[PDB]
Symmetry: C2
Amino acid sequence: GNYNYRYRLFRKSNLKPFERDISTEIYQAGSTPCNGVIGFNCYFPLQSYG
Amino acid sequence: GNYNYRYRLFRKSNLKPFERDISTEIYQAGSTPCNGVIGFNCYFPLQSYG
């Protein structure tokens, strides 16, 4: 596996044309404020191709 | 996507039978140390199924 290539899988809104998002903030997918820690319903925004 | 189910993708050694691993330390896959930060050759050990 080559896991050094990542893609943004979760975002609040769709991107504008020619816009990039290099921010690494934990995406809340529920109703729980989980303070930037991965776990239940808090996922990392970037996922590896592998 | 249901990303609440995760599996450990990276480990230094194989498991003994009936052994569990709940650690979340960053798997160093290169010469450079990771310092607990994801990036190039430093991966999170648990990956969601999707």
